[PDB]
């Protein structure tokens, strides 16, 4: 036998979740999942972004969730994450096709913030601007990783 | 002659996550709805006998590698007995452990069988959980009224 | 991690046999009905846009390795244009040769698309056969009224 | 890619044919097919039933249509053909599961009557007696191969 | 399912044969097996070259020996066979990598001349010109099928 | 990603040879080829029979040619070789299905002779003392001879 | 997809290492890599042995290193690990075929002691008794996990 | 039917070694192992460079270790070896991803030295003259030396 196929199930599972639960809540559910995946498989402690890239691809390769490039952006030392071939699971998600994308946000977040302390206080953010979402495939997810903060006035409004 | 992404790990982590936040009964209900949804995506032809339905359902399971199933119509209660081998295991979540996916089958057999020819229509699905006789991934269900 | 029987040869010989005994138009009609039958066995969810339908149909094709498809809604006629790549080839039968299976797709897209949300319902399926621009196994169809 | 899957198609194709066309006509259609398959793949000329068996299995193996044993029955020199794992194609056919069985009748017929002249004037016959159809799997088809004949009174009634 | 590998066996077989036996005797040996393969798998009777081509590629596909095109050449009456991905079994043959090439000659011989009473009259010859074996990859094997003919004292030389 | 199938070629090749050359000459030829293969892939030098066994099985796994046990017999100083799943190529050979068997002689002959103290004075003989054994199981002995 | 094969590489690596370095140094080396593998793939925190077992087998499945059972032994407090199909890489190791066994010790070490504060205190030791390595296949590796302890002059011996 | 994956083991093994032993000692070790592998699988004795090439590629196909070209340079009498797709095992080695590269030296060293008249006076040197070449492409030269 092969292993069983979950594509059908996730197609229908994503439909149900989306029906019952807002875009928001579902995304937050999916990042926690991705964060948890990253407690199950992890890179070793890498010396350089490049080495981190090779190790992440090895991990992706292990479950066939595609390939990734990492680019350290000096101008603000954010890190650009370009993930290719996010597995497609039916037409849910925004854009349609990309339901699993938050899983990556949580995955990359756990993965990358495990590094030197160099990337300790970082947060992942999916690039959703339809502009540069256009010239790149449906199943390509672009994320940026940067350091977090918070206003005193945001602080209330718990 | 190429490859497909694996969802096993993701489902281990989804299940764990769901079980953590929402609890058992509520997970089951959802899973049932989803299996019931699957059933609107793939479905058998209108079958005339149980034998024939059995074959059509195994053909459906083979398509997605979800195991095998036997079907038994019972004299005493006019109840249909469903014995499903090899439910895909996704980690240690579920009752008993390894069986998180079980209610998907309830939803699924629920839908696949009622779309059927005759008084089949009006039955419902309970999963047996009383009667170490049967392997971890074997799920036993009844369709009965 | 095991194997499945091949039907290619059998279909080469079936096609040849059918084409021999019953002729072209009658073969097409049958094949259309069969594709239309397939459509009652696997089916997309209710889609709201064409983009979404496209993805759902490719997911269905992938399941059975029947190729890929693009879908295009046209201003001028409100016509939907279907371009299917890699129809399984089964030997040299069909018009043009290699394409015996083409009308299965007519039946199939016929059913998959009409079960759909909206005025989708009332369309019909012609296959284009006028306009060496497009590969042997690419089938072009219109859904138009 | 794999090759495409025809199981779905044949499930539905066998349904349609059975709907429109009697058991009889469909079987006769399927033997002609099997006979034609045997014009596409064939054994070499074998010296012994055993050698013929090995060569047929090699051919079966080539398209995964299962395995076969051949037994030469001295008492009447019929040949017993026991085919295992006829591919299953949905629930049509009698018994349900065995829609493709006549394909074998035509296949074996071409295959076996290609031999020495030893098996020249032979006809294939599927054993359908529910008795010894019982203790053997659904996808096991038993055929007997024997020499043909015909009454003068059968001869009219064209 | 998991099959045995013959590549190494053939690597050593070709080398041994080539050692004991001429280039010429080896080729003739290999054409005969080639024509024997044609007795075991066949196209149906095709109405046109194009259909013949589809039917031959299906056969090639069956045993994974690569692909082919056929072009009817009429300034001449010959048929140009271009075969891609002749399986490679080590360094034997001329050019090296190409030992199995005569098998093609025998196979295409049988395969083509079974066809429309037109072709039955043809001999296969392999193009070995330096010129246009150079435009094309080493496992590409080019054959022409032409119609045969002979001379009053080529015979008497025997 | 798909490699080419050689079975049908081998089926037809075996036939062609067996037609034209004989059996004893075929056998001799196939034994050289087995010898040849053993110059292409080899075990390390082995300390024990049990080690050699694992080593040889790794070599057979590598090309999918089956599995083998090795038994060292004391009474006479011989080595019983049992090979399961000789690849079958059609109905040629003695018995039918085992055309490739002599390749095994050449091969084990070479793989074992290579050996440090598995005497390169060891010769090879395929057997029909031990019969029922599956069609594709081949039995062989390696015992030392002194030169006729 | 088609992966590279390391079996031969490991066959030669084990042999070379064993040549240069003691049995003991090799095992210790291999436990460390074993425990490093445990830093790259992990179970989640399991509530019971049985669940731990399911989670460990899933991990094993991931890299195809075989299967395992865990039995809580309470006349004692030890945990009996029985691992099947330790990958074989040639004839090295004691018994031969078993070179990779210490990797298991390090891997199970990390894997089990991550678990319920209960286990964190445990050392893995491999059962190598003649007796019950004989009931079981050579790639079956039996380990016990017990809790650690030490002596006032085993220390002073350093 | 599934064999075991060694990648994760290799990723972790490379790391462990590189931690504890150095690079030059690692390299030396891996070169012996390549030497070792070349005693386990070998080409036939080759007449030409072009033949050797096909032969070596068949050996690499056998274990999925990539492909190689061989070029014989006249000006000095050297042989340029270009290996594509060195198996990658994690981010170890110089550059990252190429930990296994020295195995290639041992291996080509052995496979070529074996050769009739590919001089067993030929030594090996891996190169960083030729840079962009893909991460997993390894370039090597074999040129004769006389002993320092």
Could you please describe the fold and organization of this structure?
Eight copies of one chain form a homooctamer. With 158 residues, chain A is of the alpha+beta class. Chain A has six helices and four strands; from the N terminus they run H-H-H-E-E-H-E-H-E-H. Chain A folds into two domains: 40 residues, Single alpha-helices involved in coiled-coils or other helix-helix interfaces (Up-down Bundle), CATH 1.20.5; 118 residues, Alpha-Beta Plaits (2-Layer Sandwich). Chains in contact: A-B, A-C, A-G, A-H, B-C, B-D, B-G, C-D, C-E, D-E, D-F, E-F, E-H, F-G, F-H, G-H. At the C-E interface, helix 1 of C face helix 3 of E. Chains A, D, E, G: Keywords: Cellulose biosynthesis. Chains A, D, E, G: This is Cellulose synthase operon protein D. Chains A, D, E, G: May have a major role in the perfection of crystallization, involved either in the pore structure itself or in the organization of the pores within the linear array of terminal synthesizing complexes (TCs). Chains A, D, E, G: InterPro entries: BcsD_bac, Cellsynth_D_sf.
Assembly annotation: homooctamer
**Which structural category fits the helices and strands of chain A?**
alpha+beta
Radius of gyration of chain A in whole Å, from Cα?
16 Å
Instruction: Report the sheet-strand fraction of chain A.
Output: 15-25%
Residue share in helix of chain A: 40-55%
**What global shape of chain A is seen?**
globular
Number of strands of chain A: 4
User: Largest chain interface and its two residue counts?
Assistant: A-B, 31 and 30 residues
Q: How many DSSP helices of chain A? A: 6
CATH architecture of the largest domain in chain A: 2-Layer Sandwich
The CATH class label of the largest domain in chain A is Alpha Beta
**Order of H and E elements of chain A:** HHHEEHEHEH
The fold-level CATH name of the largest domain in chain A is Alpha-Beta Plaits
Distance between the termini of chain A: 52 Å
What does the largest sheet of chain A look like? 4 strands, antiparallel
Strand order of the largest sheet of chain A: 1-2-4-3
Total separate domains of chain A:
2
